[PDB]
Amino acid sequence: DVVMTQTPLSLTVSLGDQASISCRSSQSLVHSNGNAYLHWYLQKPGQSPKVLIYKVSNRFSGVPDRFSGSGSGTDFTLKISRVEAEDLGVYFCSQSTHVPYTFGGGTKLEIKRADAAPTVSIFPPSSEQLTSGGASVVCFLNNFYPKDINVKWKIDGSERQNGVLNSWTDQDSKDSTYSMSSTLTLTKDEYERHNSYTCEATHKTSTSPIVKSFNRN
Amino acid sequence: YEVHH
């Protein structure tokens, strides 16, 4: 198969700035008819991919002029001038010169926004869950930027690792932030062994952990 | 179709 290698895997661009994505093919994409059937698609979170550029440099109908493709042979570039928030998601290069048709691995475009500290909320288990013999302690780390964050659970001062499940949102189309949930699931008996439950966030926006805690008692 | 088809 013709292997399509994209670089970088991710890039962070400020609004109004220019993004540049590289695609290298394992064989020339120059068809016997002299054209290169190298295309660019954008896939937004939860959506199907949509074509931006076909045959190296042709803009699909309704694609803004700030998207431009160039290159020849094995080396191609997509340039996105004047980046806008709704540009975020995963860009794919694809070739159809050769069968099978192939895709690059994707490049994630992240919008740079101002640093935003996570809003941390901790929730004790509900009375309804506890009757079931289960105890889920839920921590939201909401609307933060940049993306990198670390969550730590502490129970009466001791770090807890087992029974923690994390879930991350994609970058938000409206405010360019990320959100994360962290859920510690114990038995009701395990939960009632301890008093003080702490969700600690480590983020660029603070030299100290950003903490929310509660006492069972 | 330009190619294949």
Next chain:
Amino acid sequence: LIQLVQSGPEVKKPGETVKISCTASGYTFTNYVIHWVKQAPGKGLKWMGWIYTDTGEPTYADDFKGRFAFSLETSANTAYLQINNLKNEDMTTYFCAREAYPNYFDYWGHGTTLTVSSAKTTPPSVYPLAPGSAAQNSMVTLGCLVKGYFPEPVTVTWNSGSLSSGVHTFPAVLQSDLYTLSSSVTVPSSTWPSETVTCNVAHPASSTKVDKKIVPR
């Protein structure tokens, strides 16, 4: 307006057969080639093959020759993908795509998600997430814990759809063959608990709908 529409989410046991549909509207169906594209792991794309809508002749990528079959109902403007003897690795999203005459994909289906699992349909347990009673702030964050369901999806709304600002719902995490997610809503603290906040959870597969008021502890 040209559209490709696909059949709804599928949930199968290993070794079973599934047949997904792709219905085209707004153009002469038999004048364009239909392709099938799999969402590869790490949210890559993988070309499966094409089918000529005028002759019904399919062309498969090597990895899809064994268990995969493309078919047409041209009088219904419909292309089918049949997968036999389902495997765990078949569990992903499948897109159909129309091929433009310059040999790029111009219109895509929204995708069909295929779950491959031995699990039984299980309605979620829906738990309110209210802050620890002891704490007091300008905004308050509330939540809805949607625990132990199968299969995907659930639909989570707040106040029957009337609360949409300041909501996000985390992707489900799969533990012991069951899904769990939480949904976060943020409202002015002056409005809670005076203005009731209700999470609305629908699980189509188990025909369940639950309203859970978030009552202060």
